[PDB]
């Protein structure tokens, strides 16, 4: 057990090990507050997140456990990883606060386009890394569900990490924006297509103002649902609404993205398919010719299987809290 020190910053008490120095508040909200800090053990800047009200209810206690289980499982170069998790508590009885430490990420994808025009090489590398992280995620039956440029961190070497597992609507697959059916892992592939289109053109692809406006913009590019997709939509009202729409053919993407790398446009056509069963998977997209400069099938690893059977458990607050405490205690830090 390290030595902790206690301080008040922005009327929040932070009690962290000595190794974390120069804490500066950089965010707050209902999920918790975040300080940037200097980790003297690794010599890196880190984000320290103090969870807010982690065990106030059953719902909160289970959400804390789910987040810690998820973050402890992710061990991949293009996915955010848990550098440390700690509590000042010496036992379960006084366990009330949970702190999570991750790499401090200097810029997101929105930030990097603000000060430079990305080359087609830059876009190949960025999208390749996103798909490489997603192949790992999806191989553990994890879905991100909220991929967007602000959840993608990029450094000065154009190296990328996927953050913050589940303007959000602009990157959402239509079957989950309107709750048409149970989510496929390829809802994340839809988001990658939206991000890639935006990086290639400098314009948001589907910037609708509400759900209906956005759905109409999507359907104008990809076509209205056919009978095979309509059969998969379980909500009867959703099916009746889609059938009320004037039919629209899919558009030729090459006529929408003139001047872009033709292999880029080809990959976009494979990601932005309306039927999620027909969208390209992350593993398949890594093999697409657009990424020929970067694809190495021996350097695109998969995850350990991830046991989500806890999700169907019905437990007391203090049982979720005890499970969380066990996961804090059993945490093994990554190698330096």
């Amino acid at each position: 057990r390290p030595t902790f020190y206690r301080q008040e910053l922005n009327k929040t008490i932070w009690e962290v090990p000595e190794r974390y120095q120069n804490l500066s508040p950089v965010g707050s909200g209902a999920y918790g507050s975040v300080c940037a800090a200097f980790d003297t053990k690794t010599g890196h800047r880190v984000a320290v997140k103090k969870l807010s009200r982690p065990f106030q209810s059953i719902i909160h206690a289970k959400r804390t456990y789910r987040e810690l289980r998820l973050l402890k499982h992710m061990k991949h170069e293009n996915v955010i990883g848990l550098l440390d998790v700690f509590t000042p508590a010496r036992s379960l009885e006084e366990f009330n606060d949970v702190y999570l430490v991750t790499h401090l990420m200097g810029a997101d994808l929105n930030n990097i386009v603000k000060c430079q025009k990305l080359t087609d090489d830059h876009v190949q590398f960025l999208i390749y890394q996103i798909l490489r992280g997603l192949k790992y995620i999806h191989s553990a039956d994890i879905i991100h569900r909220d991929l967007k440029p602000s959840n993608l961190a990029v450094n000065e070497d154009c190296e990328l990490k996927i953050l913050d597992f589940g303007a959000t609507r602009w990157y959402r697959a239509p079957e989950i924006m309107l709750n048409w059916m149970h989510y496929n892992q390829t809802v994340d592939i839809w988001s990658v297509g939206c991000i890639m289109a935006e990086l290639l053109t400098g314009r948001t692809l589907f910037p609708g103002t509400d759900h209906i406006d956005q759905l109409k913009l999507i359907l104008r590019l990809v076509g209205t649902p056919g009978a095979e997709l309509l059969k998969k939509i379980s909500s009867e009202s959703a099916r009746n609404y889609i059938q009320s729409l004037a039919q629209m053919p899919k558009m030729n993407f090459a006529n929408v993205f003139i001047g872009a790398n033709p292999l880029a446009v080809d990959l976009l056509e494979k990601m932005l398919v309306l039927d999620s069963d027909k969208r390209i998977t992350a593993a398949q997209a890594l093999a697409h010719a657009y990424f020929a400069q970067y694809h190495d099938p021996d350097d695109e690893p998969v995850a350990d299987p991830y046991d989500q059977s806890f999700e169907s458990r019905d437990l007391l607050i203090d049982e979720w809290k005890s499970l969380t405490y066990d996961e804090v205690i059993s945490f093994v830090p990554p190698p330096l």
């Binding site: 810029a107 990097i112 830059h122 000065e156 154009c158």
Partner: peptide, 7 residues
């Protein structure tokens, strides 16, 4: 790929 600028 090689380099990007900070915001």
């Amino acid at each position: 790929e090689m380099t990007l600028k900070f915001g």
